[PDB]
Design a protein around this ligand. Structure first.
Ligand SMILES: CCCCCCCCCCCCCCCCCC(=O)OCC(COC(=O)CCCCCCCCCCCCCCCCC)OC(=O)CCCCCCCCCCCCCCCCC
Ligand SMILES: CCCCCCCCCCCCCCCCCC(=O)OCC(COC(=O)CCCCCCCCCCCCCCCCC)OC(=O)CCCCCCCCCCCCCCCCC
Ligand code: HEA
Ligand code: HEA
Ligand SMILES: CCCCC/C=C\C/C=C\C/C=C\C/C=C\CCCC(=O)O[C@H](COC(=O)CCCCCCCCCCCCCCCCC)COP(=O)(O)OCCN
Ligand SMILES: CCCCC/C=C\C/C=C\C/C=C\C/C=C\CCCC(=O)O[C@H](COC(=O)CCCCCCCCCCCCCCCCC)COP(=O)(O)OCCN
Ligand SMILES: CCCCCC/C=C/CCCCCCCCCC(=O)O[C@H](COC(=O)CCCCCCCCCCCCCCC)COP(=O)(O)OC[C@@H](O)CO
Ligand SMILES: CCCCCC/C=C\CCCCCCCCCC(=O)O[C@H](COC(=O)CCCCCCCCCCCCCCC)COP(=O)(O)OC[C@@H](O)CO
Ligand SMILES: CCCCCCCCCCO[C@@H]1O[C@H](CO)[C@@H](O[C@H]2O[C@H](CO)[C@@H](O)[C@H](O)[C@H]2O)[C@H](O)[C@H]1O
Ligand SMILES: CCCCCCCCCCO[C@@H]1O[C@H](CO)[C@@H](O[C@H]2O[C@H](CO)[C@@H](O)[C@H](O)[C@H]2O)[C@H](O)[C@H]1O
Ligand SMILES: CCCCCCCCCCO[C@@H]1O[C@H](CO)[C@@H](O[C@H]2O[C@H](CO)[C@@H](O)[C@H](O)[C@H]2O)[C@H](O)[C@H]1O
Ligand SMILES: C[C@H](CCC(=O)O)[C@H]1CC[C@H]2[C@@H]3[C@H](O)C[C@@H]4C[C@H](O)CC[C@]4(C)[C@H]3C[C@H](O)[C@]12C
Ligand SMILES: C[C@H](CCC(=O)O)[C@H]1CC[C@H]2[C@@H]3[C@H](O)C[C@@H]4C[C@H](O)CC[C@]4(C)[C@H]3C[C@H](O)[C@]12C
Ligand code: CUA
Ligand SMILES: [O-][O-]
Ligand SMILES: [Cu+2]
Ligand SMILES: [Mg+2]
Ligand code: NA
Ligand code: NA
Lengths: 79, 514, 43, 84, 58, 227, 259, 46, 79
């Protein structure tokens, strides 16, 4: 929808070797957006940028663990 | 009387003798471990086992060499024997606490031994990084015994530091300022300040590892919000000062030996030597993260630590050139101690220079955790700290014992050791540049030739160690009692004869203020 | 340095004994363990 | 920088006793009153088995291995929640 | 209380050859022997525990 | 990879590794010079019967032995820091690949589009095919496009490891709970080897890295083949 | 036979018994953590207390009763105590470093925030503030005690020292109660880890410092101190101010800023 | 008081050079041998 | 999802007497949401809650000034 996505671009908020927070922020951003587009009457397609970025950057086991905890009700970030 | 004298001592000379005996015994243990290392690597394949037994050996090798051989010999041994004599003091400030610094060390060593006998040992590296050193990857008592071993060695050295600083500040003749005390006394004072400040941070860090392993803290465990890298900061905040602690008393001994056997009354540029040791001690506290250039730190931080590390070359070079300038114009006595000290100046310089190579964080990416680092620190330790130890031992053995060594045998010993250490460690530069990692029990086939040569060198150094033992025996066997030495006017520790009486300076020296 | 003549001089023969004993005390126990390495990795 | 007094003719025991009884112990009294006002127990919160809390990587060396050293049943839940 | 420091000064300066840790009298010897016996026995016991913990057990 | 009797660095496979080679040459020349001057001066001090044992004034000569080392240090630090900031520059990659360290093997994730992941284990010596390299081969190599800027993300699922490829100038520690980034660019196709570079237990010596660098069209063919 | 002023100490067994006590306490902690047994640890704690008791008893014998503490000897002990306190400051610095490291960069496992999700900190205006007033007050009362001693006033020295000790005990009982009431534990992630290990080592030093003050109290009851010579009292006061300053740093850092 | 002078300021006797040789051999030899026997212990344990 | 909106409810993020940041944050949120929707195609109707809240709380002149500065390119908050 403004795509041709290849991989996550440089993000001036996360310019250093430690990219942990970049994965974390985009995972939060995707799921906050996805929740907003459900509870208020919209389309998750608007959330797609964050989805591609976090999927590109985040270890699969981090994503999997975070998803399990969101389902368990123990995810400690705010969504 | 034997128990009163040797278990209940309050005498700086006898306590120094205990440290020297302890450190010599520890040197045998550390030498045996080093040969097991080089036997594993002496041909491609596996000799002993996988990396666990191998790295229990490596870990123990480093702890024994550093905490049980170098520091007890230099600081407990030469420091206790020489510092009070060199300032005319009748003993140390806290003569009874001094004995406890000594007797904490056999228990510390026993705990290290226990760590290697229970379970599968602590195969962690002497750095003991989590999570490998945590309770999942190193379950059981071994790592905890290692932590406790360090705690006791740490208390030993902290109390010893308090003793040396107090003695050196408070117990000089009233006319002697700090700028009239000998350079070896300065070197022990500065070493003691570094120990006082650095060991409590290590103690904090290894205590947090103990509680992560046993009380369900998570200082270093990301599941609790902890960080393995925090441990590394705490460890290296101690561990860089620690290598200056290992070399500074050596610098002080080298200054005395080079002065003496150049026939000089004084080292060249005394105040510059004091300045340089103080500068090295200070800069040694602000460079620790050069042990961490590959952990993911920001580029500006890597730049700062590159720069601050390299600046230590400036005061160190002042000392090297001042030793050369002390030789300059001397009536050179080619004694065995002089040979140790000359080997020190050159080989310490090579090792310091490969340290400056590693300070460059860009090149350190490729050199970190390879044998280039191993080559760097064995040049400053096996050919620096150890050469200063051997030079001081041969130089002062007649003072401590009252007997002379056989100089020809001592020169042979130097010659064997010089060949052995250089054959052992010089090829390790090639292994490092070409990418052989540290802490490996086996290596890709291309690395065979230099590992084979390095292991052959390690056996030559073994022959030197064995010969030393024989040389010490021969001296005590023949009983040539010292009469006089030259240069007593600028070497006060000799002026009460060999060995000095149990109590010296009961009447203090007379020193006036003009 | 100057020194009195040896109180109990150690002849070249005595030195050969002291040297040999010293070297053997290092070599024989390690040698025995290393010789039997295979015997250990199988028990 | 906020204080407001005088005192220094020359300092001694009488002055430090004056400070002890006239300032220091009154401050303790007032903080003791403040604390014995805001005492009384907060509404204990719903249990959520967060994975960064109630850490258990090795059993504690006392009790059943699963209770902290100063465990308070009213306010310290176990990894499985509050006790009965 | 009354100040009896002078009588302790006389006691601990008595020329009897005793080291300071024993100069208080027979109580000192008892406390020393208790301390040293616990230390040496405890140390022997720690060595037994090493031997036990050094081999597969439990 | 290293070869028998090698003395120096593996041949550079990336531009940054070439820069490091030239910087090492520069610094090693200085190391050799200073080492040899100190050795020479030692021999000079020791080879004359002429003596001078009275007090020598030190002030003048210590200007020279502080200023000259200071200048040398600056001449090392200038190119050293240039290369440092070069490595750090924004480069926008066309591909992100993750690697996770384990006891004792590496896994790889290519999740830009497809959700591809696989494990990469050392080939035991008893299984090497003839002519393959002891302790260095893996069953599944890191297939990558040559001549392109690649973002590698490194972490661990257990203890510390470190992901290294010496001929690309790469070494990035693998730390659980942390996602470390490095940039990879190979000038050439081929196979590029490295080894775990943080002590990690029993088989630290035996969990190598092998990159397989191929043209983009061949990388795309390989990716497409994994659907 | 000496014509210097320094102290040649009688040969002593307490260095050896102290070092052996360290062996027994550490191997005893190992036995407690890994082989379900407190026996060695209890022996080590007992021999450590016996060692400290007899060693410092002998220092009192050597000084109050035998006269070996000349001004030069006293000056050495002043340096020794300052250096010891410095080493203890650096020990605490390591725990503050851990605290700021974790709290300034909270990881995703915490919720990416500080305090972590699910942590409910104590109110720093309740018992922690009271504890702060208690230790500050005790710094005032110990200064009154010091001046009374210097002015030769036995009664007010004893009163002021007793008040100082009472406040140290009050702090310790308040902290024990706060530990019991805290809804978070040492196992509650890095928040609980930094909180209990740092304030716990501090509480240990309060108990040590209070014990030292109690030793001084009984030595004062026995007239050991002169109005000019009382270094054990000065050392205990320095150590007590150190304990007070560490508390202030804990209060601002962990209880207040980290809440 | 204690004995003083060469050979008297040490916790071991040098009165007889062959007894001394045995002592020094046991002393340094035991330290050098210990790591080999610990390695054998770990290898034999399991 | 469903209205019956009367006025802005209590917000635990802004419990005190100064409500400036409550007005500001809901203004930012509305316009951030708006921008996100208008781009990816979707509906500004999902942004409606923030719009009602900032309209309830914010002085007209503040909204008017902020709107002028967004048009001018001088709005200093991040949208
Ligand atoms: C001042 C002049 C000298 C200055 C220079 C110093 C000299 C340097 C070179 C030294 C050249 C001389 C070497 C002399 C050999 C000493 C005998 C006492 O000895 C004597 O009473 C001997 C003469 C009288 C005979 C009594 C009967 C003894 C029979 C059997 C004894 C066996 C001895 C060997 C037993 C072996 C000892 C262990 C008290 C001394 C304590 C020193 C510490 C020792 C190291 C312990 C390490 C900790 C272990 C933890 C496990 C660690 C586990 C590892 C992981
Ligand atoms: C006492 C003896 C004991 C026996 C043990 C050995 C002791 C060490 C003595 C050995 C005598 C050393 C003399 C200089 C050695 C340089 C060897 C070399 O070719 O090095 C090459 C480089 C990398 O080079 C390359 O990437 C390309 C190499 C190939 C060039 C093209 C020619 C192709 C054929 C190559 C033929 C070989 C060339 C050598 C040409 C030779 C030129 C000198 O490797 C390296 O960086 C390794 C550098 C290690 C860092 C320390 C350097 C400062 C030491 C100066 C004093 C030495 C102290 C020795 C330690 C003390 C020594 C006394
Ligand atoms: C005696 C011990 C000792 C000493 C003195 C030193 C001294 C120095 N060390 Fe080293 N070092 C160790 C023991 C020591 N080191 C150990 C044990 C490790 C590894 C720990 C581990 O991982 O286990 C290590 C690791 C280590 C690293 C980490 C490498 C890595 O792990 O990747 C670095 C990086 O900067 C470093 C640098 C230096 C420097 C710059 C000096 C400088 O102080 C040297 C200064 C001296 C000179 C420069 C030579 C004399 C000077 C002149 C003749 C003047 C002219 C010279 C110039 C102008 C350059 N050392
Ligand atoms: C003081 C420190 C010191 C010394 C002297 C040595 C000495 C030696 N070391 Fe040491 N080594 C370390 C400290 C030291 N080492 C450290 C810190 C590490 C890293 C550990 C880790 O990675 O965790 C290490 C790692 C290390 C490795 C790498 C292991 C690996 O990465 O897998 C190797 C391999 O060859 C090695 C070999 C040797 C050899 C052959 C010697 C030989 O030169 C030894 C020869 C013998 C002597 C030098 C004699 C010693 C005895 C005395 C001086 C007593 C004299 C007596 C009297 C005066 C009475 N060492
Ligand atoms: C009266 C209370 C107030 C004063 C403080 C009291 C205790 C001080 C004792 C020393 C503390 C220092 C060690 C730090 C170790 C942790 C103890 C921290 C303080 C404490 O007591 O923490 C308690 C846990 O203790 C636990 O695990 C068990 C603790 C007991 C075993 C500790 C064993 C490890 C000791 C290692 C020491 C190494 C020292 C090295 C020094 C080298 C120099 C907290 O209880 P909790 O139930 O989790 O939460 C409360 C919920 N209601
Ligand atoms: C954010 C990290 C936080 C970590 C924790 C921080 C804690 C900080 C703690 C501070 C502790 C403060 C304690 C105060 C203790 C008092 C020591 C007072 C010593 C003193 O007052 O003595 C004087 C020196 O003072 C001197 O401060 C010499 C020094 C005189 O000494 P002397 O021997 O006669 O020599 C005199 C020679 N001219
Ligand atoms: C429930 C009970 C739990 C107990 C657990 C054990 C802990 C308790 C330790 C408490 C410390 C008590 C120290 C008592 C010292 C008494 C001896 C003394 O004070 O000795 C004084 C000298 O001081 C000196 O040695 C100065 C000596 C300084 C000693 C400092 C002690 C601090 C110890 C800290 C150790 C633990 C570290 C924490 C772990 C991380 C004697 O000199 P004066 O006073 O001038 O007298 C002479 C005049 O009379 C002449 O006119
Ligand atoms: C994990 C578990 C680890 C357990 C480890 C336990 C380790 C050791 C067991 C310790 C047993 C201690 C026994 C009492 C020691 C008292 C020493 C003391 O008080 O030493 C004094 C000097 O130190 C001074 O003052 C300076 C002030 C006194 C210093 C007292 C320090 C005690 C040691 C505590 C550990 C400190 C670690 C610090 C850093 C974290 C007196 O020195 P002396 O030479 O005696 O006399 C001189 C005469 O002139 C006195 O009349
Ligand atoms: C890395 C440091 C180690 C250095 C290397 C030591 C150098 C060699 C020392 C000699 O050691 C001896 O070697 C014998 C072999 O020559 C062994 O006898 C073994 O072999 C004999 C012949 O096969 C048998 O008669 C014996 O029973 C059997 O014990 C013996 O045990 C061992 O003590
Ligand atoms: C002078 C001073 C010298 C001191 C010497 C003291 C010697 C006492 C040894 O007694 C042992 O104590 C063990 C504990 O240490 C016991 O194990 C027991 O103790 C544990 C419970 O505390 C558990 O392991 C088991 O329930 C149980 O087998 C065990 O029976 C017994 O052999
Ligand atoms: C330098 C010192 C290093 C020390 C490191 C280790 C410290 C603790 C070692 C363990 O001590 C042993 O542990 C057993 C287990 O807790 C004890 O009970 C044991 O007693 C019997 C021994 O078989 C049986 O009843 C049981 O197996 C068992 O409970 C046994 O008495 C005791 O000595
Ligand atoms: C390494 C240490 C952080 C340790 C931590 O993670 O616990 C941090 C804390 C403060 C930092 C320093 C301060 O930020 C000040 C400097 C900032 C410069 O950009 C780098 C050097 C500089 C001197 C920093 C180096 C390094 O990153 C320091 C020392
Ligand atoms: C001033 C001080 C002591 C002089 C004295 O009182 O004897 C001397 C001793 C060592 C000297 C320093 C060293 O010689 C090293 C540097 C030498 C340079 O020539 C000047 C700065 C330099 C850093 C010197 C400054 C100053 O002259 C020092 C610090
Ligand atoms: Cu994985 Cu080393
Ligand atoms: O540490 O160099
Ligand atoms: Cu360093
Ligand atoms: Mg590393
Ligand atoms: Na091998
Ligand atoms: Na006073």
């Amino acid at each position: 929808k403004i795509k041709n996505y290849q991989t996550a671009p440089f993000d001036s908020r996360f310019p250093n070797q430690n990219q942990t927070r970049n994965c974390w922020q985009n995972y939060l951003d995707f799921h906050r957006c996805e929740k907003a587009m459900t509870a208020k009457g919209g389309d998750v397609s608007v959330c797609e940028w964050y989805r591609r970025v976090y999927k590109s950057l985040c270890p699969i086991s981090w994503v999997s663990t975070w998803d399990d905890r969101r389902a368990e009700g123990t995810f400690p970030g705010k969504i | 009387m034997f128990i009163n004298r040797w278990l209940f001592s309050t005498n700086h000379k006898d306590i120094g003798t205990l440290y020297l005996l302890f450190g010599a015994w520890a040197g045998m243990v550390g030498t045996a471990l080093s040969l097991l290392i080089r036997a594993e690597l002496g041909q491609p394949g596996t000799l002993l086992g996988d990396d666990q037994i191998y790295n229990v050996v490596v870990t123990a090798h480093a702890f024994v060499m550093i905490f049980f051989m170098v520091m007890p010999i230099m600081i407990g041994g030469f420091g206790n024997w020489l510092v009070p004599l060199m300032i005319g003091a009748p003993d140390m400030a806290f003569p009874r606490m001094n004995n406890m610094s000594f007797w904490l060390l056999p228990p510390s060593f026993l705990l290290l031994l226990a760590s290697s006998m229970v379970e599968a040992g602590a195969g962690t590296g002497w750095t003991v990084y989590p999570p490998l050193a945590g309770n999942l990857a190193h379950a059981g008592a071994s790592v905890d015994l290692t932590i406790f071993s360090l705690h006791l060695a740490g208390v030993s050295s902290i109390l010893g530091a308090i003793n040396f600083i107090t003695t050196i500040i408070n117990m000089k003749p009233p006319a002697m300022s700090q700028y009239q005390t000998p350079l070896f006394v300065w070197s022990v004072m500065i070493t003691a300040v570094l120990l006082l400040l650095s060991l409590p941070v290590l103690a904090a860090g290894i205590t947090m590892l103990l509680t992560d392993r046993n009380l369900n803290t998570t200082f270093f465990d990301p599941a609790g919000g902890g960080d393995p890298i925090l441990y590394q900061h705490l460890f290296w905040f101690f561990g860089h000062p620690e290598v200056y602690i290992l070399i500074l008393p050596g610098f002080g001994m080298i200054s005395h030996i080079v002065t003496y056997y150049s026939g000089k009354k004084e080292p060249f540029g005394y105040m510059g030597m004091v300045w340089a040791m103080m500068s090295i001690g200070f800069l040694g506290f602000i460079v620790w993260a050069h042990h961490m250039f590959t952990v993911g730190m920001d580029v500006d931080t890597r730049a700062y630590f590159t720069s601050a590390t390299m600046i230590i070359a400036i005061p160190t070079g002042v000392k090297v050139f001042s030793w050369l300038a002390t030789l300059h114009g001397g009536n050179i006595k080619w004694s065995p101690a002089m040979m140790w000290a000359l080997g020190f100046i050159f080989l310490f310089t090579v090792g310091g220079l490969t340290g400056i190579v590693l300070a460059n964080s860009s090149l350190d990416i490729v050199l970190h955790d390879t044998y280039y680092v191993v080559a760097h620190f064995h040049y400053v330790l096996s050919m620096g700290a150890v050469f200063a130890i051997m030079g001081g031992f041969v130089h002062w053995f007649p003072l401590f014992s009252g007997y002379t060594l056989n100089d020809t045998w001592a020169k042979i010993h130097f010659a064997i050791m010089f060949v052995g250490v250089n054959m052992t460690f010089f090829p390790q530069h090639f292994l490092g540049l070409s990418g052989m990692p540290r802490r490996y029990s086996d290596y890709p086939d291309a690395y065979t030739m230099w590992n084979t040569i390095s292991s052959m060198g390690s056996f030559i150094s073994l022959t030197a160690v064995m010969l030393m033992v024989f040389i010490i025996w021969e001296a005590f066997a023949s009983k040539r009692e010292v009469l006089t030495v030259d240069l007593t006017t600028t070497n006060l520790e000799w002026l009460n004869g060999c060995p000095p009486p149990y109590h010296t300076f009961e009447e203090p020296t007379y020193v006036n203020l003009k | 340095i100057t020194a009195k003549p040896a109180k109990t001089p150690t002849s070249p023969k005595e030195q050969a004994i002291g040297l040999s004993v010293t070297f053997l005390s290092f070599l024989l126990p390690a040698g025995w363990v290393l010789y039997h390495l295979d015997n250990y990795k199988k028990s | 920088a906020s204080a407001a007094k005088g005192d220094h003719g020359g300092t001694g025991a009488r002055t430090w006793r004056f400070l002890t009884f006239g300032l220091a112990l009154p401050s303790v009294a007032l903080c003791t009153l403040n604390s014995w006002l805001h005492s009384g127990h907060r509404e204990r919160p719903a249990f959520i088995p967060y994975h960064h809390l109630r850490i258990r990587t090795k059993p504690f060396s006392w009790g059943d291995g699963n209770h902290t050293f100063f465990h308070n049943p009213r306010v310290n839940p176990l990894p499985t929640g509050y006790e009965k | 209380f009354e100040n009896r420091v002078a009588e302790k000064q006389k006691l601990f300066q008595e020329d009897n050859g005793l080291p300071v840790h024993l100069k208080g009298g027979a109580t000192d010897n008892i406390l020393y022997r208790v301390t040293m016996t616990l230390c040496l026995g405890g140390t022997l016991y720690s060595l037994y525990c090493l031997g036990w913990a050094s081999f597969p057990h439990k | 990879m290293a070869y028998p009797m090698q003395l120096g660095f593996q041949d550079a496979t990336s531009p940054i590794m070439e820069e490091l080679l030239h910087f090492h040459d520069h610094t090693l020349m200085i190391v050799f010079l200073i080492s040899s001057l100190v050795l020479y001066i030692i021999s000079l001090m020791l080879t004359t019967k002429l003596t001078h044992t009275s007090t020598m004034d030190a002030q003048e000569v210590e200007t020279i032995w502080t200023i000259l080392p200071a200048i040398i240090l600056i001449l090392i630090a200038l190119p050293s820091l240039r290369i440092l900031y070069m490595m750090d520059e924004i480069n926008n990659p066309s591909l992100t690949v993750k690697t996770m360290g384990h006891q004792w093997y590496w896994s790889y994730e290519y999740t830009d589009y497809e959700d591809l992941s696989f494990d990469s284990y050392m080939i035991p010596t008893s299984e090497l095919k003839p002519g393959e390299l002891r302790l260095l081969e893996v069953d599944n190599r890191v297939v990558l496009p040559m001549e392109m800027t690649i973002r590698m993300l490194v972490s661990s699922e257990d203890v510390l490891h470190s992901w290294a490829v010496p001929s690309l100038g790469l070494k990035t520690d693998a730390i659980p709970g942390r996602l470390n980034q490095t940039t990879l660019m190979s000038s050439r196709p081929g196979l590029y080897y490295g080894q775990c570079s943080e002590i990690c237990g029993s088989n630290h010596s035996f969990m190598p890295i092998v990159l397989e660098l191929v043209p983009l069209k061949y990388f795309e063919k390989w990716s497409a083949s994994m659907l | 036979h000496q014509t210097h002023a320094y102290h040649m100490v009688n040969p002593s067994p307490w260095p050896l018994t102290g070092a052996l006590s360290a062996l027994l306490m550490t191997s005893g902690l190992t036995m407690w953590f890994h082989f379900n047994s407190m026996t060695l640890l209890m022996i080590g704690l007992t021999t450590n207390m016996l060692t400290m008791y007899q060693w410092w008893r002998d220092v009192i014998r050597e000084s109050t009763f035998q006269g070996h503490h000349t001004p030069a000897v006293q000056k050495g002990l002043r340096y020794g105590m300052i250096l010891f306190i410095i080493s203890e400051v650096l020990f605490f610095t390591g725990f503050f470093w851990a605290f700021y490291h974790s709290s300034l960069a909270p990881t995703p496992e915490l919720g990416g925030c500080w305090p972590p999700t699910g942590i409910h900190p104590l109110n720093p205006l309740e018992v922690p503030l009271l504890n702060t007033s208690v230790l500050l007050a005790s710094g005032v009362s110990i200064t009154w005690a010091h001046h009374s001693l210097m002015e030769g006033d036995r009664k007010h020295m004893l009163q002021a020292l007793f008040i100082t000790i009472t406040l140290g005990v009050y702090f310790t009982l308040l902290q024990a109660s706060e530990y019991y009431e805290a809804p978070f534990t040492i196992s509650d992630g890095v928040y609980g880890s930094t909180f209990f290990v740092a304030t716990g080592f501090h509480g240990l030093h309060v108990i040590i410092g209070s014990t030292f003050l109690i030793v001084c109290f009984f030595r004062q009851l026995k007239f050991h101190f002169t109005s000019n010579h009382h270094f054990g009292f000065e050392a205990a006061a320095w150590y007590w101010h150190f304990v007070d300053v560490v508390w202030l740093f804990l209060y601002v850092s962990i209880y207040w800023w980290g809440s | 008081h204690y004995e003083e002078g060469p050979g008297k300021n040490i916790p071991f006797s040098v009165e007889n050079k062959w007894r001394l040789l045995a002592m020094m051999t046991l002393f340094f030899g035991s330290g050098f041998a210990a790591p080999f026997f610990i390695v054998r212990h770990q290898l034999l344990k399991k």
